[PDB]
């Protein structure tokens, strides 16, 4: 549930996201990729963004990411940039899949891999 997912999240970022829309910003799902592959361009991903435009640049990340490393699975930007509830909801669980699947035994450290952003 969102309640469920929403709690994973923050305790695996270190966020304080209240509703599942907030990951419409992209940011999140960038950051989930980077504690899994590591090699996410974190610096320029605005973690902290509330214009569109900048989400728009935290997807074209996170689909480089995706095509970079042969991820086959669909990312549907225009869908999740409004930040609307269901779509959200469905791309989280499945990044929360493939965090399971993939994540290492390397420790991640969320907060630095941001600059304490």
């Given at each position: 549930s969102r309640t469920e997912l929403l709690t994973w999240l923050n305790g695996l970022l270190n966020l304080n996201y209240?509703?599942?829309?907030?990951?419409?910003?992209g940011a999140a799902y960038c950051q989930i990729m980077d504690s899994i592959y590591?090699?996410?361009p974190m610096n320029r991903?605005?973690?902290?963004?509330?214009?569109e435009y900048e989400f728009q640049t935290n997807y074209k990340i996170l689909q480089s990411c995706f095509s970079r490393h042969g991820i086959e699975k669909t990312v549907y930007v225009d869908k999740l940039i409004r930040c609307k509830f269901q779509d959200n909801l469905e791309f989280l669980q499945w990044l929360k899949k493939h965090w399971i699947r993939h994540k290492d035994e390397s420790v991640y450290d969320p907060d630095a891999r941001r600059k304490y952003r």
């Amino acid at each position: 549930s969102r309640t469920e997912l929403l709690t994973w999240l923050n305790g695996l970022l270190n966020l304080n996201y209240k509703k599942i829309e907030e990951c419409g910003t992209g940011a999140a799902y960038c950051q989930i990729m980077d504690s899994i592959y590591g090699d996410l361009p974190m610096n320029r991903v605005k973690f902290n963004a509330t214009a569109e435009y900048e989400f728009q640049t935290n997807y074209k990340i996170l689909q480089s990411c995706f095509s970079r490393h042969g991820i086959e699975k669909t990312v549907y930007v225009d869908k999740l940039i409004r930040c609307k509830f269901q779509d959200n909801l469905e791309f989280l669980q499945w990044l929360k899949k493939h965090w399971i699947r993939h994540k290492d035994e390397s420790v991640y450290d969320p907060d630095a891999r941001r600059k304490y952003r």
